[PDB]
Amino acid sequence: VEELYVINPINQWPAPGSFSSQKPPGTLLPGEDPEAVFKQYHVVYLVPGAQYHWKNILIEKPVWIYGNGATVRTSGTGPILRIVGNRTEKRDVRIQDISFFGEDCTPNRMEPMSEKLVYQMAIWVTDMKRVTIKGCNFTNFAGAAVFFEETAYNGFFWSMQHLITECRFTGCRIGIANGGRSEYSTASFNNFFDCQICFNVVGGNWNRCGNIAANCRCVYLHTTNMWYEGAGGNFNAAHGSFTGNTMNHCDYGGNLWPTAFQLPDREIQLAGFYFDNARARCPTWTGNTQYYGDMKILNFNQANDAAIFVIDGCALYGQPGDTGSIETTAALTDKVFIQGCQGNKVTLFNIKAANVVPAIGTIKQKP
Amino acid sequence: LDRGPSFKPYGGTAYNPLAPKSAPINSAFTVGNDTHFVAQLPQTYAAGGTG
Amino acid sequence: YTQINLYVSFFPMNYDTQSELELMLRNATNDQNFSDYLGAVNNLYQIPAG
């Protein structure tokens, strides 16, 4: 404990080469450039309970990031954590246990959406397959939270099996966004809060099986010419599932976002379920709870008796005035059915009495 | 004798030394899509009508 | 180094005064003594970190 070994003096030699490399086995310290570490390893651990600062981290090879309770902040116009792939990757990406924050605090919910805010996301996957976002916390994003782009693929290779589970989204303007042709992936049990749009749906055939959206203005947006389409845009759209979710307090109660949204072409009035696309069909709709959540069924593909929108096993429950009301176009009265439902006394705009079983709600007409 | 690029025999700077360190020049940008213009225009000349 | 020199100042002593001073320093008892001002032996011993 005192080290009394004797020593001889140095003999004025040139000293031999002493090196102290391999100090991280696979980890990533704070204040270290992540682009040179993600290139070298396959699994990158992070320091437990650290405090990072990332901006435009380009990832080309699929790596796994165990966050261990890390905190990644950012500042600037770039996204965090840009994931660009090729078609030929056998490995997968798993981003796990990280709390992504934004360049905000109690975000500017009165500022309109524009081209300036479109690059304020935290994960932007270009064409990487089999990504996984598991147990994360995304706060205060002026743009999207994630955005899954996909370029033009061929040969019925629908694979791209993504998972977005167990996440917490607070204050993000747009939650899970997805580009066109981003088909057949799941996004469930993500607890939304204080978001303007929970799902900016462009790609179809998704599966949403447990998400909770409290105090959010919109949950399911699908129009023509939204934001966040990417290369290979609005094609083969809105075919997903939407089962057992929760969208309480979208119009009355504790909602804070405004109703206008300012799309790149026009402005529209948001609802808890806004849908307007003549070329796309409607998702399945089971087990969803709505307290004071509006629905706007404007246009789908009913052209040659090709689609019928059916609400099954859901709650409606909007009493005061027109809060939580369901709005349909008068040319779509024969195709919107509600079979199996519970409601307080909710305003139904342009829905026939024989098309709803059991007989609930107030039936009005909105010319 | 060459001293290399690590040589600076003075403190501060010799170019715009009075400027605030956060002040930009009159410049044009490229960020995202909108080429932002930021400028300061001392001279004022004419054009009472349409300029 | 492109160029280098070596400058020595020669004292202009008289040739008879020089020939008396040369023959006194050719003598074996008039050896020029010198000594280093430091007078020390360097011995650098390593201390490990900590």
Short mmCIF file of C-alpha atoms in Angstrom, two decimals:
data_model
loop_
_atom_site.label_atom_id
_atom_site.label_comp_id
_atom_site.label_asym_id
_atom_site.label_seq_id
_atom_site.Cartn_x
_atom_site.Cartn_y
_atom_site.Cartn_z
CA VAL A 1 0.00 0.00 0.00
CA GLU A 2 3.12 2.18 -0.11
CA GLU A 3 5.17 0.65 -3.02
CA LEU A 4 8.76 0.66 -1.75
CA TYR A 5 10.19 -1.16 -4.76
CA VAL A 6 13.57 0.29 -5.69
CA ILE A 7 14.19 2.02 -9.00
CA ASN A 8 17.18 2.57 -11.24
CA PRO A 9 17.56 5.85 -13.18
CA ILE A 10 16.68 6.10 -16.85
CA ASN A 11 19.65 5.71 -19.17
CA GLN A 12 18.88 8.59 -21.61
CA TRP A 13 17.52 6.10 -24.15
CA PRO A 14 14.79 6.78 -26.66
CA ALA A 15 11.83 5.32 -24.80
CA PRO A 16 9.95 2.36 -26.31
CA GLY A 17 6.46 2.86 -27.67
CA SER A 18 3.80 2.99 -24.95
CA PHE A 19 0.16 3.09 -26.07
CA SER A 20 -3.09 3.27 -24.12
CA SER A 21 -5.70 2.41 -26.76
CA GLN A 22 -8.89 0.29 -26.48
CA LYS A 23 -10.19 2.36 -23.56
CA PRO A 24 -13.81 1.92 -24.69
CA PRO A 25 -14.62 -1.75 -25.30
CA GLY A 26 -17.83 -0.78 -27.10
CA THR A 27 -19.10 2.24 -25.18
CA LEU A 28 -19.59 5.88 -26.17
CA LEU A 29 -18.50 8.67 -23.83
CA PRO A 30 -20.13 12.12 -23.69
CA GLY A 31 -18.45 14.71 -25.87
CA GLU A 32 -17.22 12.12 -28.37
CA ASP A 33 -18.05 12.08 -32.09
CA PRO A 34 -20.57 9.26 -32.65
CA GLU A 35 -20.01 8.90 -36.40
CA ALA A 36 -16.61 7.27 -35.90
CA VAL A 37 -17.97 4.88 -33.25
CA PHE A 38 -21.10 3.76 -35.12
CA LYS A 39 -18.87 2.91 -38.09
CA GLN A 40 -16.65 0.57 -36.06
CA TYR A 41 -18.96 -1.42 -33.79
CA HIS A 42 -22.24 -3.32 -34.13
CA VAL A 43 -23.58 -2.77 -30.59
CA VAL A 44 -22.92 0.61 -28.97
CA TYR A 45 -23.57 1.01 -25.26
CA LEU A 46 -24.08 4.43 -23.74
CA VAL A 47 -23.04 5.82 -20.36
CA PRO A 48 -25.87 5.23 -17.83
CA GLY A 49 -27.63 8.47 -16.98
CA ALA A 50 -25.39 10.60 -19.18
CA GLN A 51 -26.19 13.88 -20.95
CA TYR A 52 -25.43 13.93 -24.67
CA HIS A 53 -25.69 16.46 -27.48
CA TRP A 54 -26.17 15.05 -30.98
CA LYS A 55 -26.99 16.68 -34.32
CA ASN A 56 -27.25 15.06 -37.78
CA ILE A 57 -25.63 11.76 -36.79
CA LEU A 58 -25.35 9.90 -40.09
CA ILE A 59 -25.75 6.13 -39.72
CA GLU A 60 -25.12 3.85 -42.70
CA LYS A 61 -24.55 0.41 -41.23
CA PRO A 62 -27.23 -1.05 -38.92
CA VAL A 63 -26.16 -0.79 -35.29
CA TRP A 64 -27.88 -1.25 -31.94
CA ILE A 65 -27.88 1.58 -29.39
CA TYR A 66 -28.47 0.53 -25.78
CA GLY A 67 -29.19 3.86 -24.16
CA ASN A 68 -29.15 2.81 -20.48
CA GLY A 69 -31.12 5.89 -19.49
CA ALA A 70 -29.12 8.38 -21.52
CA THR A 71 -30.38 11.81 -22.52
CA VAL A 72 -29.75 13.14 -26.02
CA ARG A 73 -30.41 16.85 -26.50
CA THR A 74 -29.97 18.86 -29.67
CA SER A 75 -29.89 22.36 -31.12
CA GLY A 76 -30.11 23.41 -34.75
CA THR A 77 -32.08 22.86 -37.92
CA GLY A 78 -30.88 19.31 -38.52
CA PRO A 79 -32.53 16.11 -37.37
CA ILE A 80 -31.01 13.93 -34.74
CA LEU A 81 -29.74 10.53 -35.81
CA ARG A 82 -30.13 10.28 -39.58
CA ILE A 83 -30.44 6.62 -40.60
CA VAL A 84 -29.66 6.05 -44.30
CA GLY A 85 -29.58 2.47 -45.55
CA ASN A 86 -29.30 0.38 -48.66
CA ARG A 87 -31.39 -2.54 -49.78
CA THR A 88 -28.75 -5.11 -48.78
CA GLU A 89 -28.46 -5.25 -44.99
CA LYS A 90 -29.01 -8.49 -43.09
CA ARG A 91 -28.70 -6.92 -39.63
CA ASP A 92 -31.29 -4.71 -37.94
CA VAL A 93 -31.43 -1.46 -35.96
CA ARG A 94 -32.62 -1.27 -32.35
CA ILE A 95 -32.73 2.13 -30.66
CA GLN A 96 -33.55 1.56 -27.01
CA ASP A 97 -33.84 3.33 -23.64
CA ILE A 98 -32.97 6.87 -24.75
CA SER A 99 -34.78 10.09 -23.82
CA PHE A 100 -34.67 12.34 -26.89
CA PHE A 101 -35.28 16.01 -26.12
CA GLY A 102 -35.73 18.96 -28.45
CA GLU A 103 -34.66 22.57 -28.89
CA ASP A 104 -37.73 23.72 -26.96
CA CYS A 105 -39.41 23.83 -23.56
CA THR A 106 -43.24 24.02 -23.30
CA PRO A 107 -43.36 24.25 -27.08
CA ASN A 108 -44.72 27.03 -29.26
CA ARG A 109 -48.11 25.53 -30.01
CA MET A 110 -49.43 28.74 -31.59
CA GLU A 111 -46.77 28.87 -34.32
CA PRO A 112 -48.11 27.55 -37.65
CA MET A 113 -46.53 24.62 -39.44
CA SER A 114 -44.26 25.61 -42.31
CA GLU A 115 -41.21 24.53 -44.29
CA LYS A 116 -38.86 25.79 -41.56
CA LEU A 117 -40.08 23.27 -38.98
CA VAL A 118 -40.18 20.18 -41.19
CA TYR A 119 -36.63 19.02 -40.36
CA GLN A 120 -37.11 19.13 -36.57
CA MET A 121 -37.37 15.36 -36.03
CA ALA A 122 -35.28 12.96 -33.95
CA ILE A 123 -35.22 9.76 -36.03
CA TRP A 124 -35.43 9.90 -39.83
CA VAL A 125 -34.99 6.47 -41.44
CA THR A 126 -34.47 6.78 -45.18
CA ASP A 127 -34.61 3.19 -46.45
CA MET A 128 -33.30 1.07 -43.58
CA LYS A 129 -35.35 -2.05 -42.89
CA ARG A 130 -36.21 -3.66 -39.53
CA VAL A 131 -35.71 -0.70 -37.22
CA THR A 132 -37.00 -0.85 -33.64
CA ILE A 133 -37.77 2.04 -31.30
CA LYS A 134 -38.37 0.58 -27.85
CA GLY A 135 -38.85 2.39 -24.56
CA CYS A 136 -38.03 5.98 -25.51
CA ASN A 137 -39.21 9.42 -24.41
CA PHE A 138 -39.63 12.11 -27.08
CA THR A 139 -40.36 15.63 -25.82
CA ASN A 140 -40.87 19.05 -27.39
CA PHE A 141 -40.42 18.58 -31.15
CA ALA A 142 -41.57 21.34 -33.47
CA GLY A 143 -41.74 18.93 -36.41
CA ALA A 144 -42.25 15.19 -36.42
CA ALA A 145 -40.97 12.78 -33.79
CA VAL A 146 -40.05 9.97 -36.17
CA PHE A 147 -40.42 9.84 -39.93
CA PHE A 148 -40.09 6.57 -41.86
CA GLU A 149 -39.40 7.43 -45.48
CA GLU A 150 -39.18 4.72 -48.14
CA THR A 151 -38.00 4.96 -51.75
CA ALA A 152 -39.51 3.14 -54.73
CA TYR A 153 -39.17 -0.63 -54.35
CA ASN A 154 -40.52 -3.37 -56.60
CA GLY A 155 -41.32 -7.06 -56.62
CA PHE A 156 -43.88 -7.21 -53.76
CA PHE A 157 -41.06 -6.93 -51.23
CA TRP A 158 -43.27 -5.50 -48.51
CA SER A 159 -40.97 -6.59 -45.70
CA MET A 160 -39.54 -3.51 -43.80
CA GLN A 161 -40.87 -4.78 -40.48
CA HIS A 162 -40.60 -1.91 -38.02
CA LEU A 163 -41.66 -1.73 -34.38
CA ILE A 164 -42.40 1.41 -32.35
CA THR A 165 -43.47 0.36 -28.87
CA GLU A 166 -43.55 1.62 -25.28
CA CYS A 167 -42.76 5.25 -26.12
CA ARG A 168 -43.88 8.50 -24.50
CA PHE A 169 -44.52 11.53 -26.72
CA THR A 170 -45.09 14.91 -25.05
CA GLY A 171 -45.48 18.23 -26.82
CA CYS A 172 -44.46 17.00 -30.28
CA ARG A 173 -46.36 18.69 -33.09
CA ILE A 174 -46.46 15.47 -35.13
CA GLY A 175 -45.99 12.08 -33.50
CA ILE A 176 -45.19 8.98 -35.55
CA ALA A 177 -44.95 10.22 -39.12
CA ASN A 178 -44.37 7.85 -42.02
CA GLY A 179 -43.67 8.32 -45.70
CA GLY A 180 -45.27 6.61 -48.63
CA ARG A 181 -44.64 2.91 -49.29
CA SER A 182 -43.65 2.36 -45.63
CA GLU A 183 -45.86 -0.68 -45.43
CA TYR A 184 -46.61 -3.45 -42.91
CA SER A 185 -45.18 -2.32 -39.59
CA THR A 186 -46.58 -1.92 -36.10
CA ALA A 187 -46.74 1.02 -33.71
CA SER A 188 -48.52 0.23 -30.46
CA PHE A 189 -48.64 1.21 -26.78
CA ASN A 190 -47.21 4.67 -27.35
CA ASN A 191 -48.68 7.03 -24.77
CA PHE A 192 -49.27 10.33 -26.54
CA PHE A 193 -49.82 13.57 -24.63
CA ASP A 194 -50.26 17.22 -25.70
CA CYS A 195 -49.61 16.50 -29.39
CA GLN A 196 -51.27 18.15 -32.35
CA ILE A 197 -51.24 15.07 -34.62
CA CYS A 198 -50.40 11.63 -33.28
CA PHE A 199 -50.18 9.89 -36.69
CA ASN A 200 -49.45 11.71 -39.95
CA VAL A 201 -50.38 8.63 -41.95
CA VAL A 202 -49.14 8.38 -45.54
CA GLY A 203 -48.06 4.75 -45.80
CA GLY A 204 -50.75 2.15 -45.24
CA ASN A 205 -51.11 -1.39 -43.85
CA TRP A 206 -49.85 -0.38 -40.40
CA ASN A 207 -51.12 -1.81 -37.11
CA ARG A 208 -51.93 0.39 -34.10
CA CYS A 209 -53.02 -1.79 -31.20
CA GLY A 210 -53.01 0.00 -27.86
CA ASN A 211 -51.89 3.61 -28.22
CA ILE A 212 -53.25 6.21 -25.80
CA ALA A 213 -53.77 9.79 -27.01
CA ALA A 214 -54.79 12.07 -24.14
CA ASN A 215 -55.22 15.83 -24.69
CA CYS A 216 -54.31 15.60 -28.38
CA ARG A 217 -56.03 17.55 -31.15
CA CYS A 218 -55.73 14.99 -33.95
CA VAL A 219 -54.86 11.30 -33.87
CA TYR A 220 -55.37 10.02 -37.43
CA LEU A 221 -54.67 12.48 -40.24
CA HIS A 222 -55.00 11.44 -43.87
CA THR A 223 -55.55 13.99 -46.65
CA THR A 224 -54.06 14.66 -50.05
CA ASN A 225 -50.65 16.44 -50.01
CA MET A 226 -49.72 16.40 -46.34
CA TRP A 227 -46.40 17.19 -44.81
CA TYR A 228 -43.88 14.34 -44.45
CA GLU A 229 -44.33 12.30 -47.61
CA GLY A 230 -40.73 11.96 -48.78
CA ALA A 231 -39.57 10.37 -52.00
CA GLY A 232 -42.12 7.89 -53.27
CA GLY A 233 -45.06 9.83 -51.93
CA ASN A 234 -48.80 9.33 -51.50
CA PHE A 235 -49.25 5.92 -53.12
CA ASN A 236 -51.23 2.85 -51.93
CA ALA A 237 -52.27 4.67 -48.80
CA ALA A 238 -54.31 4.28 -45.60
CA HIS A 239 -54.92 0.55 -45.30
CA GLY A 240 -53.87 -0.01 -41.70
CA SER A 241 -55.48 -1.34 -38.57
CA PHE A 242 -56.59 0.79 -35.64
CA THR A 243 -57.67 -1.40 -32.73
CA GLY A 244 -58.24 -0.76 -29.04
CA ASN A 245 -56.76 2.73 -28.87
CA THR A 246 -57.65 5.74 -26.73
CA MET A 247 -58.30 9.25 -28.07
CA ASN A 248 -60.08 11.01 -25.22
CA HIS A 249 -60.36 14.83 -25.01
CA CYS A 250 -59.71 15.88 -28.60
CA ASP A 251 -62.22 18.74 -28.84
CA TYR A 252 -63.39 19.57 -25.31
CA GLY A 253 -61.65 19.35 -21.96
CA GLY A 254 -57.90 19.76 -21.71
CA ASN A 255 -56.92 20.32 -25.32
CA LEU A 256 -54.48 23.12 -26.09
CA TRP A 257 -53.52 23.01 -29.78
CA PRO A 258 -55.43 25.11 -32.33
CA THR A 259 -57.65 23.61 -35.00
CA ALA A 260 -55.96 24.96 -38.14
CA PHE A 261 -52.91 23.07 -39.39
CA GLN A 262 -51.67 24.79 -42.62
CA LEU A 263 -50.86 21.96 -45.02
CA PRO A 264 -48.43 22.80 -47.89
CA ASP A 265 -51.39 23.33 -50.24
CA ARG A 266 -54.17 24.68 -48.01
CA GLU A 267 -55.40 24.96 -44.42
CA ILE A 268 -57.80 22.48 -42.81
CA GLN A 269 -59.78 22.12 -39.59
CA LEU A 270 -58.42 19.25 -37.52
CA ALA A 271 -60.55 16.61 -35.80
CA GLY A 272 -59.82 13.51 -33.75
CA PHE A 273 -60.17 11.41 -36.92
CA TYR A 274 -59.66 13.44 -40.10
CA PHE A 275 -59.82 11.55 -43.39
CA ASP A 276 -60.12 12.98 -46.92
CA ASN A 277 -58.71 10.95 -49.82
CA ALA A 278 -60.73 9.74 -52.80
CA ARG A 279 -58.14 7.09 -53.72
CA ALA A 280 -57.62 5.48 -50.29
CA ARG A 281 -59.79 3.10 -48.29
CA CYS A 282 -60.57 3.18 -44.60
CA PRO A 283 -58.79 1.41 -41.73
CA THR A 284 -60.42 -1.08 -39.41
CA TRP A 285 -61.96 0.57 -36.38
CA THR A 286 -62.51 -1.56 -33.26
CA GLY A 287 -62.37 -1.08 -29.51
CA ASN A 288 -61.44 2.61 -29.58
CA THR A 289 -62.48 4.95 -26.77
CA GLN A 290 -63.54 8.48 -27.68
CA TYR A 291 -64.39 11.06 -25.05
CA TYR A 292 -65.13 14.40 -26.75
CA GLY A 293 -63.24 13.34 -29.87
CA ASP A 294 -64.45 14.53 -33.26
CA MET A 295 -64.54 12.43 -36.43
CA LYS A 296 -64.58 13.79 -39.99
CA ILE A 297 -65.26 11.24 -42.73
CA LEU A 298 -64.94 13.40 -45.83
CA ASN A 299 -64.03 11.17 -48.78
CA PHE A 300 -62.89 7.60 -49.44
CA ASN A 301 -63.20 5.02 -52.23
CA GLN A 302 -66.92 4.22 -52.26
CA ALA A 303 -67.03 4.70 -56.08
CA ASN A 304 -68.18 1.23 -57.24
CA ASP A 305 -69.30 -0.02 -53.80
CA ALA A 306 -65.63 -0.57 -53.03
CA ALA A 307 -65.40 0.52 -49.39
CA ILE A 308 -67.73 0.88 -46.40
CA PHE A 309 -66.61 2.61 -43.21
CA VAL A 310 -67.83 0.69 -40.15
CA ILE A 311 -67.37 1.74 -36.53
CA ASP A 312 -67.50 -1.35 -34.31
CA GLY A 313 -67.32 -1.70 -30.54
CA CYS A 314 -66.33 1.90 -29.81
CA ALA A 315 -67.25 4.67 -27.39
CA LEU A 316 -68.49 8.05 -28.62
CA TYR A 317 -69.71 10.04 -25.54
CA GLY A 318 -69.98 13.68 -26.46
CA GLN A 319 -72.75 15.58 -24.69
CA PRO A 320 -72.16 19.41 -24.72
CA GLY A 321 -73.21 20.91 -28.04
CA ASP A 322 -71.19 19.50 -30.92
CA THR A 323 -68.13 18.32 -28.99
CA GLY A 324 -67.08 14.82 -29.99
CA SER A 325 -69.43 14.93 -32.97
CA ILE A 326 -69.10 12.66 -36.01
CA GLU A 327 -69.19 14.51 -39.33
CA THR A 328 -69.75 12.86 -42.70
CA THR A 329 -70.27 14.24 -46.18
CA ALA A 330 -73.88 14.11 -47.42
CA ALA A 331 -72.73 12.07 -50.43
CA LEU A 332 -71.29 9.45 -48.03
CA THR A 333 -74.34 8.72 -45.85
CA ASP A 334 -74.94 5.27 -47.34
CA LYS A 335 -71.41 4.02 -46.63
CA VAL A 336 -70.76 5.10 -43.01
CA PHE A 337 -72.12 2.47 -40.63
CA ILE A 338 -71.88 2.24 -36.83
CA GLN A 339 -72.66 -1.33 -35.70
CA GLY A 340 -71.85 -1.92 -32.05
CA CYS A 341 -71.22 1.23 -30.04
CA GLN A 342 -71.85 3.10 -26.81
CA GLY A 343 -72.48 6.83 -26.57
CA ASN A 344 -73.82 9.49 -24.26
CA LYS A 345 -75.87 11.60 -26.68
CA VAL A 346 -73.57 12.58 -29.50
CA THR A 347 -74.21 14.68 -32.59
CA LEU A 348 -74.13 12.63 -35.80
CA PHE A 349 -73.83 14.82 -38.90
CA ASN A 350 -75.32 13.18 -42.02
CA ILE A 351 -75.69 9.59 -40.79
CA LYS A 352 -78.96 7.74 -41.28
CA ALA A 353 -80.84 6.17 -38.38
CA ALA A 354 -81.09 2.68 -39.87
CA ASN A 355 -77.33 2.55 -40.46
CA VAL A 356 -76.50 2.76 -36.73
CA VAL A 357 -77.21 -0.06 -34.27
CA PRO A 358 -77.94 0.42 -31.42
CA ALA A 359 -79.90 3.69 -31.61
CA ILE A 360 -77.69 6.22 -29.82
CA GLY A 361 -76.82 9.85 -30.34
CA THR A 362 -78.49 12.87 -31.91
CA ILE A 363 -78.83 12.81 -35.70
CA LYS A 364 -78.44 16.19 -37.41
CA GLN A 365 -77.63 17.38 -40.93
CA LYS A 366 -74.74 19.66 -41.94
CA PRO A 367 -75.34 20.99 -45.48
CA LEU B 1 12.67 28.87 -40.38
CA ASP B 2 9.02 27.86 -40.77
CA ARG B 3 6.81 28.10 -37.70
CA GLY B 4 3.76 26.28 -39.05
CA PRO B 5 0.06 27.08 -38.74
CA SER B 6 0.11 26.92 -34.92
CA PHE B 7 1.70 30.38 -34.73
CA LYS B 8 -0.23 33.50 -33.74
CA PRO B 9 1.89 36.22 -32.16
CA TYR B 10 -0.97 38.30 -30.75
CA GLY B 11 -4.26 38.08 -28.94
CA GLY B 12 -7.70 38.78 -30.26
CA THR B 13 -8.07 39.37 -33.98
CA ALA B 14 -7.00 41.91 -36.59
CA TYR B 15 -10.16 41.84 -38.72
CA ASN B 16 -13.26 43.72 -37.57
CA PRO B 17 -11.98 43.94 -33.97
CA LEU B 18 -14.70 46.35 -32.83
CA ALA B 19 -17.53 44.07 -33.92
CA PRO B 20 -19.68 42.18 -31.42
CA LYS B 21 -18.70 38.53 -31.59
CA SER B 22 -22.27 37.48 -32.44
CA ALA B 23 -22.74 40.03 -35.24
CA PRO B 24 -23.07 38.69 -38.80
CA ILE B 25 -22.08 40.39 -42.03
CA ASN B 26 -24.68 41.30 -44.66
CA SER B 27 -25.07 37.82 -46.05
CA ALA B 28 -27.22 35.27 -47.85
CA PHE B 29 -27.95 31.75 -46.65
CA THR B 30 -29.14 28.39 -48.00
CA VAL B 31 -30.73 26.71 -44.98
CA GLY B 32 -33.32 24.09 -45.96
CA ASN B 33 -35.02 25.78 -48.87
CA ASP B 34 -35.37 29.50 -48.10
CA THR B 35 -32.27 31.54 -48.94
CA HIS B 36 -32.39 33.91 -45.98
CA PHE B 37 -31.20 37.47 -46.51
CA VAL B 38 -29.86 39.49 -43.59
CA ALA B 39 -28.46 42.94 -44.23
CA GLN B 40 -27.87 46.54 -43.14
CA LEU B 41 -28.50 49.31 -45.69
CA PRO B 42 -26.87 52.67 -44.89
CA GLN B 43 -27.39 54.64 -48.10
CA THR B 44 -30.88 55.93 -48.97
CA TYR B 45 -31.32 57.60 -52.35
CA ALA B 46 -34.65 58.17 -54.11
CA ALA B 47 -37.76 56.40 -55.57
CA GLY B 48 -40.80 58.21 -54.21
CA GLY B 49 -43.04 56.15 -56.50
CA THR B 50 -42.64 52.50 -57.37
CA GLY B 51 -38.97 51.78 -56.79
CA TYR C 1 20.50 25.69 -42.07
CA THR C 2 21.72 27.31 -45.26
CA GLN C 3 24.98 28.79 -43.95
CA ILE C 4 27.10 28.72 -40.81
CA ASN C 5 30.32 30.32 -39.58
CA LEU C 6 32.62 30.48 -36.55
CA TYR C 7 34.04 33.77 -35.29
CA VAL C 8 37.19 33.99 -33.16
CA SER C 9 38.79 37.28 -32.07
CA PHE C 10 42.56 37.14 -32.16
CA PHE C 11 44.28 39.34 -29.61
CA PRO C 12 46.99 41.47 -31.26
CA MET C 13 49.76 40.95 -28.72
CA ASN C 14 53.33 42.00 -29.48
CA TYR C 15 55.42 39.16 -30.87
CA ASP C 16 57.98 39.44 -28.06
CA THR C 17 55.29 39.63 -25.37
CA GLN C 18 53.55 36.64 -26.98
CA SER C 19 56.79 34.65 -27.08
CA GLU C 20 57.23 35.20 -23.35
CA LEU C 21 53.62 34.21 -22.61
CA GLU C 22 53.70 31.18 -24.92
CA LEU C 23 56.81 29.76 -23.21
CA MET C 24 55.14 30.20 -19.81
CA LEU C 25 52.07 28.21 -20.89
CA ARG C 26 54.04 25.45 -22.59
CA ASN C 27 55.24 24.70 -19.05
CA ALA C 28 53.72 21.60 -17.48
CA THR C 29 52.99 23.27 -14.14
CA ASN C 30 50.91 26.00 -15.83
CA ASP C 31 48.05 23.70 -16.81
CA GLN C 32 44.74 25.49 -17.26
CA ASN C 33 42.26 24.27 -14.66
CA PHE C 34 38.54 24.40 -15.34
CA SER C 35 35.49 23.22 -13.46
CA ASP C 36 31.80 22.93 -14.29
CA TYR C 37 29.70 25.41 -12.35
CA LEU C 38 26.88 22.97 -11.63
CA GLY C 39 29.01 20.04 -10.51
CA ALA C 40 26.30 17.42 -10.39
CA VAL C 41 25.26 14.00 -11.64
CA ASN C 42 21.83 13.72 -13.24
CA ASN C 43 19.77 10.74 -12.09
CA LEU C 44 16.14 10.83 -13.21
CA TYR C 45 13.92 8.43 -11.24
CA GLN C 46 10.41 7.62 -12.44
CA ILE C 47 7.36 8.17 -10.26
CA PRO C 48 4.29 6.28 -11.56
CA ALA C 49 0.99 8.09 -11.91
CA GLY C 50 -0.68 8.07 -8.51
#
